[PDB]
Amino acid sequence: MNNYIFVLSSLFLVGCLGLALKPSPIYGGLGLIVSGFVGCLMVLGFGGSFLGLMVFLIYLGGMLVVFGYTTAMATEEYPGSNWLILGFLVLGVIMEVFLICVLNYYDLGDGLGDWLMYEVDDVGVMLEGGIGVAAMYSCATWMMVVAGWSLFAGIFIIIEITR
Amino acid sequence: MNPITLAIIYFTIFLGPVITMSSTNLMLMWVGLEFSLLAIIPMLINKKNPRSTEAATKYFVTQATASMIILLAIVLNYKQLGTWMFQQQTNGLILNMTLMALSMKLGLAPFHFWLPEVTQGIPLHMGLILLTWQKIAPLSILIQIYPLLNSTIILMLAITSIFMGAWGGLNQTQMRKIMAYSSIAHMGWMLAILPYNPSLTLLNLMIYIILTAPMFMALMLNNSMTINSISLLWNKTPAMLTMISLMLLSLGGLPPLTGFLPKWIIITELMKNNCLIMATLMAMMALLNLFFYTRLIYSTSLTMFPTNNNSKMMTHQTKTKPNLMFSTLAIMSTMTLPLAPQLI
Amino acid sequence: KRFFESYHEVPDGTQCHRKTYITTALGGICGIIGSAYSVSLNPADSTLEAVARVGRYTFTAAAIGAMFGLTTCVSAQVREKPDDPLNYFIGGCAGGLTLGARTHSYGTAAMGCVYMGTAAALFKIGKLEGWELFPTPKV
Amino acid sequence: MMNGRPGHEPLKFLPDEARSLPPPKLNDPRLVYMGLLGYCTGLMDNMLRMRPVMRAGLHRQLLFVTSFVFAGYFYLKRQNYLYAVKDHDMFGYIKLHPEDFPEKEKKTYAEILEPFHPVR
Amino acid sequence: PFLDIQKKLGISLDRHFMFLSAEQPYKNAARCHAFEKEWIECAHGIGGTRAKKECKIEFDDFEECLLRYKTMRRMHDIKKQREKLMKEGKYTPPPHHSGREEPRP
Amino acid sequence: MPSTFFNLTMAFSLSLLGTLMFRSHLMSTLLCLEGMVLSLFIMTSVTSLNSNSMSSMPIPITILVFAACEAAVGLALLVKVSNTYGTDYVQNLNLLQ
Amino acid sequence: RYGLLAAILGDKTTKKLHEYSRVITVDGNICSGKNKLAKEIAQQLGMKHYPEAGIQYSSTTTGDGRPLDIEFSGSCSLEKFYDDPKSNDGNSYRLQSWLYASRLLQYADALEHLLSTGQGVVLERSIYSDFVFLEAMYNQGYIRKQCVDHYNEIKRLTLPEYLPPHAVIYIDVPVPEVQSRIQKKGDPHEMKVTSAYLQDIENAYKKTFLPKMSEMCEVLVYDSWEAEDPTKVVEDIEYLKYNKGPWLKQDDWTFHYLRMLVQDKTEVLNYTTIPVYLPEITIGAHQGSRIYNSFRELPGRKYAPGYNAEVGDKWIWLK
Amino acid sequence: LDLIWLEKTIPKSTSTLHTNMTTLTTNQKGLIKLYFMSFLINIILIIILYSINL
């Protein structure tokens, strides 16, 4: 539809509300994995195939998975029934509708119109994300170096903490 | 620490503030802040004592959420101006976020709860770095953006800090926390003049660094985290009793010593700008800070507390000396006042 | 916000009702904020206990707000002199006294009276002399 | 403040323009103070390290009195410049924007009538 | 910035990409490349305090090249109007809405 | 986008309220903390994409790379805590009082 | 002095360690002819034999090494310990606290020799074994309960940092036979000591010291007869396998920090001076100032080693 | 008037006013949740301080 993004945006807020009610450590991981799926989709909507898939590849299964992993190792003591949380969550599901509603009557609005892909070359190539992300190696080679040191000194920071 | 790791970490703890200061693309300023967060956490848990893990886990959560808030400000700006950096046009709320966030990393005012607690569980050494080479980074970001921040908020965080710092300090007896509290206070003065004359913030900082760095290397010379512990200074090492006395009164604003200049010129600049309401209240409770400074003076110098018999044993053995920095930073700090005009 | 400001617009000693209402609100607002910090830190034992504390702090603060407003307005009315720090001091004097009572302490009333009244008086002077608080940088 | 000035040297200590200013006399009271400030640092060090206060490190005493002083001449040389820039900048503005800083005529007391409060 | 080790060293690791009009890869100019230029060649040599009042035409425009909100209000208003009229049939879906009208290359 | 950009921003505030209102397990917090980084990553990517500002796409990822390590440090502290107490409840972290 | 510079450039303890390089303590009752065994074992493996810690062991350690006056050395008398048990002034606790500080200095000096030269260490009784005297003292009226807590607090604060004895030797002779051993040695203060107090000392070892250390280190129990036969005991030490114990994890980069600690005596006993004010331990400001303002005026002590001209130091004007 | 009334009013009272104020501000659980919430309150008030003085 035209509200291709809004609906999704709404789902992203629902997942964030789930993480915010701080549900059981791994039941909510799912929540993230859900909104990460959702955010992966929105970016794709705007044409960021690479940037999008990237999230589905790194935060989704790399970061998040490792997160729950550790949950299992510790902090998954799985000792308030999440169902109570789901009860509240349901409240917010529509409570947010309230927040939107005021501005809904106030109304941009009426779903989502041309509030996406503002300008795109009706002709032409090389217009695609991943050409921009690959500026790490031409004209933006300082972001690349500092990220390196993050991960690189990350190794040394982690082991030192672990030890 | 495998000396290699020591190098990588220390480099990061030092590349962290330096990238922040040098770059203009805010993003690069954010990652400078991010590195500092990552580099400091390993050192904080070096003893790995149960208190330490608590310290780092607090420092990290407080630092991390603030880092995320600073990033949100940069992300929002990017959509209100394509630029990756704050400009005259910036929405006021965008800047206020940056003030709150950066005032959390620096630990000013109503966000002053983490610092006293992390200063209590970390070693005296890493205490210094956590107090003085980690304040340079955020302050740089603020000083750069001063023209745009709000005069009202800063002042409120300034005044609050002064009060919280002072009041907190009065009760504390642990030295690490007395210093943590002082830093909150001095940090307050610094952020008070930022909107008006940033150049004075950089003086009220250096002087704080030239005052606190000698003070802590003094606390650790005898590694005393208690006033009772520093009070037996007269037996362990008598000479530092004289300068410890002046440096602490210098940390508070008493007039002959170097410490008056930062307060004096900040008050002169605020009165020049007409805040004779705000400046007056700050100076007054600033006087509360000296009370707890002098109470320590009493215990350590003006009165001689009783010592244990084993203290004679520690005297016998040659006392490992205090680095030269102590002297050069004790004198340049206790008495440079005759040279104020050129400092400002 | 156009509201609170109204307090200042009408000459002092006049329209006490509005004055007292506004002053009462400010105190009450402070009450809420104060209770909030008091509950967030130094938490309570039961939700109700804390709801009570919020109430206690709110009312006490609302009271100090009212008497300040009422006393200052009336003192000015009865005295017929609209511009006088003394009006406010009497008001602040009273406000402190309410705080003292709520805290059931004559001593607090002492410090309360002096300190609180002095502060309020200074507010009057501040307004009379056009003192500027939290000023914009004009260097 | 003074940063953002035209021609600002982005990272330089003292721009050559500061050559035009007189050099600080080596015996300027201030540099001499820095000297004493230094000697004291030295003496203090000896004391904290428990050495004969004055008769020890006579080499160090020199390093100190001579490090501080060296620093001074080159610092004061700059701070002097900074202040000098301040006038160049200040005086210039007074002129470029003359109307805002107008010369005022002060009536001889004969004319002005300040009221007289008697002490009695 | 606070310590300009970049200008001094002449390096430009952080300045080349701060605004939308900076060199975009493959010279694919972004939206507004026109305005931001007009709003920063204006505010060059004039400090901010005076890049904020007189160079307000170029920001008021660049604030609408990118937010593109005043447009919305126009279009959204237009939309409503159509709706009301159409409901009473006052207005009919244009030939465009009817499609055809010779969609051409 | 203007509409959506709101949802993401409130997502970040709902994630903000989460990390500033702890409850038992820390791993929940760190998890919440990450919810923000996702919201920031999504918003940065979205505007960069509709501004056709390709010179800035590097950032959306630099944000994630730094955020990942940031989280790595966070979890190692967490593992350190349930090794010293073994229950990972923000509740026992009070020795420093 | 040793520093990370030295560690970075060679100077690693690991490459200086050899089989004969261990921390071996021999502990016994007041009279176990322990001294001989140690010097004997020492002679066997060339181990630096450290003598039993003394009141003036620290003074022999520092500067001139001439014995200090009693008040300069903390005013402790083992002699008065015995003739006046449960004394009003508490010389017995002050004696014990100074003794713990002395062995802390001795153990640290021993570890410094071990990690630097690599020669193994024999120090007789250790800090770990010191507690038996206090346990027995509290068992009788010698020390009160808090006094015990103050020693335990100092022990908990300082002893864990130092690595455990590699092996411990136990030269045991029965409660009655040590008292006859006491009877013939000449001092009269050692004589007339409580049989029950000696009972409490050896009992405290058997009940607590040997089992505790039986995992932390290779305890080698020896009866008197095995003793007086250094050869046999020495043989057995060379026989035990130095495996079980915390010493296994001491990598070079870990030893460096331990070395830098023992290298700093002022820290070794930093927690020995903790400001806990039990009455026996307290110097007192007026007496303490006089004792310090007097100890500091002794020749060669006024200034740091190398700088006091009284004893003949020179080159002070360039040091 | 000397001793008690002129020492209880000016010199001593100021002693007490503060002493009591430090006792309330420094009696903190040390728990992170409490402290953090207070950060929440602050964000809220500052959000408003900007809002009302828009």
Ligand SMILES: CCCCCCCCCCCCCCCCCC(=O)OC[C@H](COP(=O)(O)OCCN)OC(=O)CCCCCCCCCCCCCCCCC
């Ligand atoms: C503007 C004026 C500001 C105030 C100036 C006057 C106050 C100076 C600061 C004093 C602060 C400490 C007060 C208490 C000190 C106690 C000292 C003490 O207890 O004695 C021991 C101490 C160290 O001993 P040691 O030198 O090792 O040998 C003796 C061993 N018993 O013995 C020592 O420490 C000896 C060395 C002490 C320091 C000497 C300082 C002399 C006075 C300096 C006056 C400066 C006046 C400047 C005037 C400027 C005018 C413009």
Ligand SMILES: Nc1ncnc2c1ncn2[C@@H]1O[C@H](COP(=O)(O)OP(=O)(O)O)[C@@H](O)[C@H]1O
């Ligand atoms: N902690 C202590 N408290 C009291 N006395 C101690 C303590 N440690 C050692 N001693 C004294 O050491 C003496 C035993 O030493 P001894 O066996 O004579 O030395 P050697 O090894 O030269 O034979 C005992 O008489 C005992 O009083």
